[PDB]
Ligand code: FES
């Protein structure tokens with residue numbers, strides 16, 4: 762009946778987890794976690810697969826690429 | 831174990847978004863909470879989510 766947290770474990774000493782990157786620093790491809798289960802947060806490490814299988818969810822990452830380095 | 835995404839595009843078995851930086855404006859704010867009405871962009875819905883659940887999630891920002 763009570764709504765669940767999305768992030769169970771990550772950096773709980775931080776009252777609001779925000780990441781901010783400059784485009785100029787970006788790699789050719791970055792894969793960012795939107796499931797809060799990655800062990801390498803804020804990057805996606807495939808943990809969303811286990812999460813989706815265990816919970817029936819359908820979440821996946823955000824991919825940011827550069828057309829040119 | 832509870833789902834994270836409650837309502838967004840449930841006919842897609844795994845929601846992935848991919849963008850090229852050259853297409854972006856000087857600032858893009860991406861939702862990591864699956865509560866935005868403008869998903870995949872952040873509309874501030876994370877604030878209510880954090881308030882109601884005690885969570886601490888927030889967006890990912892790509893800026894110039
Ligand atoms: S590990 Fe979280 S979206 Fe892939």
Ligand code: FES
Pocket residue numbers: 860861862863864865866871872873874875876877887888889890
């Ligand atoms: S609305 Fe989801 S992270 Fe801001």
